[PDB]
Design a protein around this ligand. Structure first.
Ligand SMILES: NC(=O)c1ccc[n+]([C@@H]2O[C@H](COP(=O)([O-])OP(=O)(O)OC[C@H]3O[C@@H](n4cnc5c(N)ncnc54)[C@H](OP(=O)(O)O)[C@@H]3O)[C@@H](O)[C@H]2O)c1
Ligand SMILES: O=C(O)c1cccc(Nc2ccc(C(F)(F)F)cc2)c1
Length: 315
């Protein structure tokens, strides 16, 4: 149940999303990651921004220890945050992630966002007016530092996240390119199916990875309350009675049947165990056709703050 990445490695088409708001106890990330694995999840998705790589990496040591899994069975992903885009900060940032999670290597290291921010440790640099500070960085140099990380062995694979077609091409069409990005993790759901972006990636043998596939966690910090609730859509709810599953299962299945590796975030035991049931049924071609027409180019992560960035993925 994996896809072959363009570098020879295999990615499990079902990933577990480990992000949770700060007000949530960090101990939960540890617990739920154990649950997730016990449920069947082998693909695990993290980042330095999440502030949970210590607990996630811990939960993996636990499952390898008790004999539930070996390291070669677990697909672990981390992300270089926007404040470490400068070439000299890439590897040290990676090693930092590797340390917290106490791992030798990460199966996948991505560029979290193309929107570079002020170099430093603070993850949200703000001027004296409380405005987020940007930084100008040639993302092609950042990718070079990522390629050195794959050769250095610290990362089995490298890809991008929140990259639009343009920025993506800047990589592919970059001189002396050693490794194409294996994938591009972006927001993707029936209200925002990235039909066109997905098409482009496939021609380049790159894998679109979908986040917010279940409508997002709807944080009050980026998500507008007046936006539609994905898992309450008439078409999805109706198809759910048809196949006698759940709207979340329909959303996830939708992604699988069209060549998209999809992430599912859940800190609830029974909703984690339910999410793996995505492999137990299949929507019809007409169902796929019906869902394909749910797109309203609606991305839940809506910060007009970043819109002012020259690398703002959307335009
Ligand atoms: N690259 C990026 O910029 C980026 C941005 C956002 C997210 N991501 C990644 O994508 C992962 C998931 O995306 P997401 O953060 O928006 O979470 P999500 O996949 O969109 O799902 C969000 C909500 O869905 C609920 N849910 C999950 N399974 C369900 C089920 N079977 N039935 C009903 N409800 C269910 C969860 O509630 P409960 O938890 O209470 O079950 C969760 O709060 C994240 O963990 C993160 O790793 C990446
Ligand atoms: O990964 C998480 O779970 C996560 C959680 C909180 C915030 C972000 N930040 C973010 C930054 C830029 C973009 C984008 F896409 F606009 F560039 C989208 C999200 C990601």
């Amino acid at each position: 149940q994996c896809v072959k990445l363009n570098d020879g490695h295999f990615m499990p088409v079902l990933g577990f999303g480990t992000y949770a708001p700060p007000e949530v106890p960090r101990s939960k990330a540890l617990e739920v990651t154990k649950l997730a694995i016990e449920a069947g999840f082998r693909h695990i998705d993290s980042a330095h921004l999440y502030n949970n790589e210590e607990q996630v990496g811990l939960a993996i040591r636990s499952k390898i220890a008790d004999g539930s899994v070996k390291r070669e069975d677990i697909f672990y992903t981390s992300k270089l945050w926007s404040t470490f885009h400068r070439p000299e900060l890439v590897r040290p940032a990676l090693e930092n992630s590797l340390k917290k999670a106490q791992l030798d290597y990460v199966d996948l290291y991505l560029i979290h966002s193309p929107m570079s921010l002020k170099p430093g440790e603070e993850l949200s640099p703000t001027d004296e007016n409380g405005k987020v500070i940007f930084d100008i960085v040639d993302l092609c140099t950042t990718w070079e530092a990522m390629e050195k990380c794959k050769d250095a062995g610290l990362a089995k694979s490298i890809g991008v996240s929140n990259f639009n077609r343009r920025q993506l091409e800047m990589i592919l069409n970059k001189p002396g390119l050693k490794y194409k990005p294996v994938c591009n993790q972006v927001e993707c759901h029936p209200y925002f199916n990235r039909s066109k972006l997905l098409d482009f990636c496939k021609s380049k043998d790159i894998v679109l990875v979908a986040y917010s596939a279940l409508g997002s966690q709807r944080d009050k910090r980026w998500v507008d309350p007046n936006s539609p609730v994905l898992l309450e859509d008439p078409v999805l709810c109706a198809l759910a009675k048809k196949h006698k599953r759940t709207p979340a299962l329909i959303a996830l299945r939708y992604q699988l049947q069209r060549g998209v590796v999809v992430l599912a975030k859940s800190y609830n035991e029974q909703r984690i165990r339910q999410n793996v049931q995505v492999f137990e049924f299949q929507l019809t071609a007409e169902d796929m056709k019906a869902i394909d027409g749910l797109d309203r180019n609606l991305h839940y992560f809506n910060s007009d703050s970043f819109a002012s960035h020259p690398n703002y993925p959307y335009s």
